[PDB]
């Protein structure tokens, strides 16, 4: 999933030697080299990145200007973009000890975030947690269950997560060492929404600790939004986006949802006054 085969089909017939140093580029401009170019036809090349790609990250294929056609140079660089995130539906995480939905929801948001690879190589993160996130897509049902129980115990043993009983999803994020951008600490906003719209361009995860609390409809930049937690007061649920499709994950229960559903989620429970969305993940 992170070292895939990429093939590009050009409109005109391209002479070899005309095609330049093709490279993939991450969002911050970092270039990864590719291997040798395979010529499937005179208008179809195939290649793969030498070094593995970051998970849950957008990459840009650039064919630099100057691709010579058999007829003629290329005026502008040819650019295409893809994403290394999985497209299979997400998996459920059973609520084992009865009071871990805050741990389950937080892991769900972490495995769908661009910080995943940084979490997986952070030795301050408990290794049982890095094990579970590593094979989240590939593990069997019984292996995922056993790995989840190991990750819950390792998390509850850290100083950040309560040793038993319920919690808040932020506490698990602090144990994962996942850097979050606090909306209230922004230089240029006095509310949650404008703090996100005006964050530094490389910012991909937000902790909404300003006012007013935001509904899904108020979350800026729906195009690039991929995950967020939803609190009802005493329960946690994860919403994650894969292949353009939103899934609601209530612990072990995964279900597809419609955009119409998400625009009806309130910014807080009007009964107990508890905030609902505190973590927002973008790609």
């Amino acid at each position: 999933m992170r070292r895939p085969t990429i093939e590009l089909e050009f409109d005109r017939a391209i002479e070899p030697g005309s095609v330049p140093h093709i490279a993939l580029r991450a969002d911050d401009g970092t270039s990864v080299a590719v291997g040798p170019l395979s010529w499937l036809s005179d208008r179809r090349i195939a290649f793969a990145p030498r070094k593995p790609l970051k998970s849950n990250s957008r990459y840009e294929i650039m064919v630099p200007a100057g691709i010579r056609s058999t007829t003629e140079r290329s005026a502008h660089p040819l650019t295409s973009s893809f994403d290394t995130a999985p497209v299979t539906p997400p998996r459920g995480l059973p609520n084992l000890d009865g009071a871990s939905c805050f741990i389950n929801t937080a892991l769900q948001l972490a495995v769908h975030s661009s910080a995943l690879d940084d979490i997986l190589s952070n030795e301050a993160v408990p290794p049982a947690v890095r094990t579970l996130l590593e094979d989240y897509d590939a593990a069997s049902a019984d292996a995922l269950d056993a790995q989840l129980a190991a990750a819950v115990a390792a998390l509850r043993a850290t100083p950040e997560v309560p040793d038993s009983g319920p919690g808040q999803t932020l506490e698990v994020m602090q144990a994962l060492r996942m850097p979050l951008y606090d909306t209230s600490s922004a230089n240029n906003a006095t509310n949650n929404a404008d703090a996100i719209r005006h964050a530094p361009p490389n910012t991909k995860a937000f902790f909404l600790n300003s006012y007013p609390p935001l509904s899904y409809a108020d979350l800026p930049n729906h195009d690039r939004l991929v995950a967020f937690d939803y609190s009802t007061g005493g329960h946690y649920v994860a919403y994650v986006k894969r292949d353009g499709i939103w899934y609601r994950i209530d612990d072990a229960q995964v279900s597809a949802v419609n955009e119409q559903d998400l625009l009806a989620l309130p910014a807080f429970n009007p009964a107990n006054g508890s905030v609902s969305i505190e973590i927002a993940i973008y790609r």
Partner: protein, 75 residues
């Protein structure tokens, strides 16, 4: 000094404090009057979250000023 604390349930709570009182002091007072542990309260003044170890003097919270309270209940 007199301040007001509005919640997302549509409910105002009035407290008597002084500009020397810490943000934790205000939360413990809120824990007594309505039963919310400070662990699970967020206080907001002018869109900005009030940090525990600070005073109301720091956030220029005068008399008459009204805070917004956001509950962060465990799940």
């Amino acid at each position: 000094m007199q301040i007001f604390v509005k919640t997302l349930t549509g409910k105002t709570i009035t407290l008597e404090v002084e500009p020397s009182d810490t943000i934790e002091n205000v939360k413990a007072k809120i824990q007594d009057k309505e039963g919310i542990p400070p662990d699970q309260q967020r206080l907001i003044f002018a869109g900005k979250q009030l940090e525990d170890g600070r005073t109301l003097s720091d956030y220029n919270i005068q008399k008459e000023s009204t805070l917004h309270l956001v509950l962060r209940l465990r799940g």
